[PDB]
Amino acid sequence: MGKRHRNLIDQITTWENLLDAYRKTSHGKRRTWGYLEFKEYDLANLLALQAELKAGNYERGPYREFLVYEPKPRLISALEFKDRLVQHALCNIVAPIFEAGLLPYTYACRPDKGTHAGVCHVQAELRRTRATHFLKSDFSKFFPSIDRAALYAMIDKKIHCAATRRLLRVVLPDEGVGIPIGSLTSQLFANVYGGAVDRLLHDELKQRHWARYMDDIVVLGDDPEELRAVFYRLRDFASERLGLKISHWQVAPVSRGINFLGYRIWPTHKLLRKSSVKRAKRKVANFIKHGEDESLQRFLASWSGHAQWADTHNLFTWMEEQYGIACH
């Protein structure tokens, strides 16, 4: 929008925005100690947040230290409602001006550039271009490797408002190499950060058939040594510029399948990854032999949404044949 963006802290703290941030922060969380302690004097709290942000006295409270293991441990320390609300009030004005720069193919944390728009983008861009090959990569410990420093050169070629910038830097200190995973600010700022790779794919390297979902980056080709090139160029970039180590990569033929986004995406079929299946299979089987065949209908309905995209007709028939339950 003429570039710049030299007064976002005025829009971040507009009451009309903090109320959106409030409704977004409470969305779903309207049953949490954070919402319910905030909801009490909600608009007097947003008036001391507005005026903490409009001042600049906003300081992000303790990341409530807790984690989920799932042998992929992320320290997903929570944030106060107040802090998730400030983040939502940032990422209501700050997010559209970063997520607009995001090349269309960054199918991560963007409005309606979802997981499923991603698997569909990949499949689609796999059909068209008739990708004979594909590079899939992935960033080691992405969020705990975002330079949080060369991030704030991207968050700073696009904020220009030196109080949004200082609110961004409270919500996320410019001092680190580690974006806190599980922060609206950080999905964005990691999308933004890994958006630097999407500009080294699409801009430099001129890869026009790719998809990035946060840290995973599919790059369909046609010469798989041009994608090992692309990949080498992508890794060298994201290591030297972004401090992102690439955990896994492959330049698999489109034939191995693009394990994108908890899927597996041939030009042909988009089978969710077999771990989703196994979880679900086991979840169903457990539910059956737990007498919990009524919350299983809730899980089923939900999983059918995660799988309505995927080519899970055969799988849905199979699960209906094994247990009877109405999948779709």
Binding site: L36, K39, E40, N45, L49, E52, F81, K82
Partner: protein
């Protein structure tokens, strides 16, 4: 900034009230829909509906299980008011779906009240 602390910040009262506010937000339009006639019992229903918030709130703040049971007596009376507004209100007041819907919301508040009564009872 720090969210304004109400004192005696009881999660259960805050939760129950937020969930009961959904009962109110469902039932109040359909209490306020109760015709002119049936106004005494709308006002009585409304004093049971909007006045159950006070029962929860006093239960949370005057953290005394007596006021928690009194809140269950009022959620039960709110359930009656659903029964009454459906059947005994001669027009309609509450459609069976509306009773069906409200009873779901009151049941959610009933669950939270039950859990809250239980967590205090231990």
């Amino acid at each position: 900034m720090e969210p304004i602390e109400e004192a005696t910040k009881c999660y259960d009262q805050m939760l129950i009230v937020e969930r009961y506010e959904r009962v109110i937000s469902y039932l109040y339009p359909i209490a306020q829909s109760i015709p002119r006639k049936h106004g005494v019992a709308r006002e009585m229903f409304l004093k049971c509906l909007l006045g159950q918030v006070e029962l929860f709130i006093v239960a949370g703040k005057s953290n005394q299980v007596s006021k928690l049971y009194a809140a269950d007596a009022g959620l039960a009376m709110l359930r009656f008011w659903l029964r009454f507004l459906a059947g005994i209100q001669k027009p309609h007041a509450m459609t069976p779906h509306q009773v069906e819907t409200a009873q779901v919301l009151i049941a959610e508040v009933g669950r939270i009240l039950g859990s809250w009564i239980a967590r205090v009872n231990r």
